[PDB]
């Protein structure tokens, strides 16, 4: 029983998951790096949050704690 879902990803797979979730009436959350500020996936979600501005977009999608 899921109310809101975050994708630990970017790109087309994130979009795909958001769409699947929206089809199940699930609120969605996108994470984006400092270079993915303009990645389409950031916009195709209900919530957008930056993953470490002090932790370069190289490391961002892999930092478990943040």
């Amino acid at each position: 029983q899921i109310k809101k879902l975050l994708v630990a990803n970017r790109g087309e797979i994130a979009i795909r998951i958001f769409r699947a979730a929206a089809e199940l009436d699930i609120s969605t959350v996108a994470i984006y790096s400092n270079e993915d500020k303009s990645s389409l996936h950031r916009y195709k979600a209900d919530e957008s949050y930056l993953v470490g501005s002090d932790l370069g977009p190289a490391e961002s999608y892999l930092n478990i704690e943040r």
């Binding site: 790109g11 087309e12 797979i13 270079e35 303009s38």
Partner: peptide
């Protein structure tokens, strides 16, 4: 047309798997 990196005039980073389009 599962589009990732290729859409507008957006710069891509060498750090990510440079998947333009499936």
């Amino acid at each position: 047309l599962d589009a990732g990196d290729g859409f507008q005039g957006a710069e891509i980073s060498p750090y990510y798997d440079s998947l333009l389009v499936k």
